Amino acid sequence: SESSIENFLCRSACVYMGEYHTTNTDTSKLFASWTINARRMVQMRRKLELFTYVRFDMEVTFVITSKQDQGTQLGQDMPPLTHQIMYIPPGGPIPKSVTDYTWQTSTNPSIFWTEGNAPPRMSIPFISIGNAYSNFYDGWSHGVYGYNTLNHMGQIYVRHVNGSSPLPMTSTVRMYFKPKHVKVWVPRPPRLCQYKNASTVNFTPTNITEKRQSINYIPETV
Amino acid sequence: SESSIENFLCRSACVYMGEYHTTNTDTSKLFASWTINARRMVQMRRKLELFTYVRFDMEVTFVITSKQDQGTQLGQDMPPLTHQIMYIPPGGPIPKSVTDYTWQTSTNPSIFWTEGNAPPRMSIPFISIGNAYSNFYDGWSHGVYGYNTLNHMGQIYVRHVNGSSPLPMTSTVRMYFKPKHVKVWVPRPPRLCQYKNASTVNFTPTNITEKRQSINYIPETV
Amino acid sequence: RVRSITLGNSTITTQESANVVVAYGRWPEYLKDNEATAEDQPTQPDVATCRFYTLESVTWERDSPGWWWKFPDALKDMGLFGQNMYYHYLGRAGYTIHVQCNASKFHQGCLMVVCVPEAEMGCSQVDGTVNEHSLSEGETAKKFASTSTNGTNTVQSIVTNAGMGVGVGNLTIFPHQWINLRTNNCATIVMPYINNVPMDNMFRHHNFTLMIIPFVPLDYSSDSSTYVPITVTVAPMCAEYNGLR
Amino acid sequence: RVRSITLGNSTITTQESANVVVAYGRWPEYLKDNEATAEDQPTQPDVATCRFYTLESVTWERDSPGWWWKFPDALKDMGLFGQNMYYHYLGRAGYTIHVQCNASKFHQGCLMVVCVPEAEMGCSQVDGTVNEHSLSEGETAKKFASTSTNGTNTVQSIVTNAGMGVGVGNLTIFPHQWINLRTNNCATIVMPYINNVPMDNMFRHHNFTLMIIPFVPLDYSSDSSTYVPITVTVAPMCAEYNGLR
Amino acid sequence: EGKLDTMEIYRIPVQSGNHQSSQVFGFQVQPGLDNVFKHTLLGEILNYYAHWSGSIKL
Amino acid sequence: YTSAGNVTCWYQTGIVVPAGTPTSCSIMCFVSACNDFSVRLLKDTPFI
Secondary structure (H helix, E strand, O other), rough: OOOOHHHOOOOEEEEEEEEEEOOOOOOOOEEEEEEEOOOOOHHHHHHHHEEEEEEEEEEEEEEEEEEEOOOOOOOOOOOOOEEEEEEEEOOOOOOOOOOOOHHOOOOEEEEEEEOOOOOOEEEEEEOOOOOOEEOOOOOEEOEEEEEOOOOOOOOEEEOOOOOOOOEEEEEEEEEEEEEEEEEEEEEEOOOOOOOOOOOOOOOOOOOOOOOOOOOOOOOOOO | OOOOOOHHOOOOOEEEEEEEEEEOOOOOOOOEEEOOOOOOOHHHEEEEEOOEEEEEEEEEEEEEEEEEEEOOOOOOOOOEEEEEEEEEEOOOOOOOOOOHHHHOOOOOEEEEOOOOOOEEEEOOOOOOEEEEOOOOOOOOOOOOOOOOOOOOOOEEEEOOOOOOOOOEEEEEEEEEEEEEEEEEEEOOOOOOOOOOOOOOOOOOOOOOOOOOOOOOOOOOOO | OEEEEEEEOOOEEOOOOOOOEEEOOOOOOOOOOOOOOOOOOOOOOOOOOHHHHHHHHEEEOOOOOOEEEEEOOOOOOOHHHHHHHHOOEEEEEEEEEEEEOOOOOEEEEEEEEEEEEOOOOOOOOOOOOOOOOOEEEEEEEEEOOOOOOOOOOOOOEEEOOOOOOOOOHHHHHHHEEEEEEEHHHHHHEEOOOOOOOOOOOOOEEEOOEEEEEEEEEEEOOOOOOEHHHHEEEEEEEEEEOOOOO | OOOEEEOOOEEEEEEEEEEEEEEOOOOOOOOOOOOOOOOOOOOOOOOOOOOOOEEEEEEEEOOOOOEEEEEEEOOOOHHHHHHHHHHHEEEEEEEEEEEOOOOOOOOOOEEEEEEEEEOOOOOOOOOOOOOOOOOEEEEEEEOOOOOOOOOOOOOOOOOOOOOOOOHHHHHHHOOEEEEEOOOEEEEEEEEEEOOOOEOOOOOOOOOEEEEEEEEEEOOOOOOOOOOEEEEEEEEEEEEEEEEEO | OOOOHHHHHHEEEEOOOOOOOOOOEEEOOOOOOOOOOOOOHHHHHHOOOOOOOOOEEO | OOOOOOEEEEOOOOOOOOOOOOEEEEOOOOOOEEEEEEEEEOOOOOOO
């Protein structure tokens, strides 16, 4: 009953930790970004490789902290900061800067939040025109091996909701991920190799198990 | 079921971002102001131009942050700030300064709020002596073309609720807008032109679609 | 004590005391009527799909790591089944695989016969992309290796990892049979259609892979035959395609 | 006043006031069960046989003697119907032929459309054997001649004898329609399987021949189009082959 | 090229004479992506959604 | 680079006219959607 599929997988984990600033000279360090694939968190990856097709809902909680730079200016009296967290479905537009029009589009679901309150949280349905996600794919996209276009699940963008010419602060986000209502099909043998990259199944040859003294060896009874 | 009218429109967006101070030498930089028309947020504008007459309730949430100026004075121990948010119906008085008597009138609904708490929120009914709002009007006011007097929906004013001779801080407000119980009539073709101003339907002539090589051209099958 | 089976204009003979594995308990069938009811029109040829297609024989010797076949792309030149792979844009099928071998009572050896669904294989070098020609040769079996491979574009086909980075003793989680030469020399596996969509293209996607691996190697003595041939015979079952009208 | 017909993934549109000729009163059908009951096994594909195959258009001008097509060998490259002509050794089918043309009300002309069963044609020179290439080009229409032909291996394709030594005014004994341009511009003929054995080979025997002959030649005036295109669309009906199992 | 702001963009040019094998037109049926179908009434609605499927009447 | 269906039109015969008619002619095309049509995952439009 503790070996049920739901108790084995319905558990939370930190999957991404990014940093983003209020003012900078880089314009890519002004927002935080993460493509959502289930092959780049090594926590849940090996537990999912026991199965061939999976189907679940997704629940995401956010933990956000800030600090003021140690550059020059003290004596401030700042109000609490506001943060925007935008989810893009598979097939939506992608921003390029924090001042883009794409932060304001009516079809990207977004969350606004101010510090001191409870941490924010939203839930995602099973978003696939297919009938299950695919942990394994033996074939081509149309041409990249192993990758198909049915495992698109979206992206996450975070920025500050300041006005104009803000004060210099730097923020950090932790994204916590959790699957719900999980169903699996076609079990597979476990991975007896260390993972090399986050896209393929490539590996180096490793031994089957560890050695002992002889085929008759049994350690002494205490 | 995702193409229903309610799922297509009942979604939130930031429509205005203003800034206002506790003490200044301008007296118009001491409060924040926004006239509420549905032709100055480009998010919801193009989605509304598919219809001729609309009818909805309105829900508005506010996100407010503050900071202390970097001018001279540090070592402060300030209490949390209070903010006043006043809605004026169509046909109410309008303030001219923050010290005006019109901030205290019994018929403008107002919200008082202090920082650290949950963000404030109020709801508005369908306020029109007509039976629907008008996205399009072919005629005169009585004389401005395209503008009638049945789409008056009100204004929003925000200031600080300090005492006398306050400390210098500057605040920022984000207004989030959301329509509810939406009903539409008489569909229209979409807008194949970039919007020029926020009052008229003026435009420049653009091409119907994009070109290709010939009338027989089909790209190669992969 | 011989049963003879006919499909179309094909006839093979098996032993009626053979033992059959159905893959996950599921026979093949057609997709019923109304999952895509409006305009998605299906059809089935049924005529020259249900017949036995016999591949060639492979030679088993003392030093043979194994053989594998991709399904389909191993029936792409097999007559009418390879014809409908060209004309139709979508399709699905199930299969019945017979594997047989001919040995004496003075030989010894042991085979594993397994059908691995979506056997996604890794490249020989770590930061590389696998080529499609190193995955399949069509009707010709590829070969595993008894040592670790190198070069570029090669599949890391050491037999202990089975090209998948898993332990080869754990492929019993898949539909499998054992062939032990001092007992039976036949194996039959029925394989339904398994995918995450109802129909799909047949040149871009490999559904499953048939693998044959010797755990106990073949050995013989003085004047026996130095080889044993293995024979694979495939019958497509309940195949179905998109409509063209 | 337009009817639209779909077969597989093909759609054409006709006029619902069209008039249909069934050849000798007989619709096509399968051979029933038990004329060859014991071991002669039949089968039918049914899937990509019932769909419209559209040939090219021919150009009708002032001096055009006619066009002809051999059935089959005109569908031998038409996809799956040409596939089963290769794999199967025996077969039979019926057909439905639509013939259509596009003209104005300022054109005039008159066509005969006839399907001649076993149109055995004679050679141009008397003591000679006809070549097979002078009988058919496949999908491309051959042409008659308005004068008597010569040379060797040519078919004596003067249009008044129709290549058969008969009078061309007497081809109304066969299943036929007239197309008169001041009236309809469409013709449809349903043609069952007609042979002296139930099944036969499809490369050695030409079952019938479609001929199109203008009796009143096309004429026009000042700025009209100098040509009229004619379009032929063939749907195979109730096709059947030998068993392969 | 040349006719993108005239009414001539909507007309398929049937020419006179005897040309009885040539092609008149051809295009792929891909709404939302292809420039032919992109700005129609069906095309503009399909670009508010990321996954869609159905059947089309021409 | 498509993986989609296509539609083409071919001259079967050619156009025949009488005397005193215009020369060229035109075809127009209309597109619509049938009754079953599904859409999912509301997003932003890439046109403004």
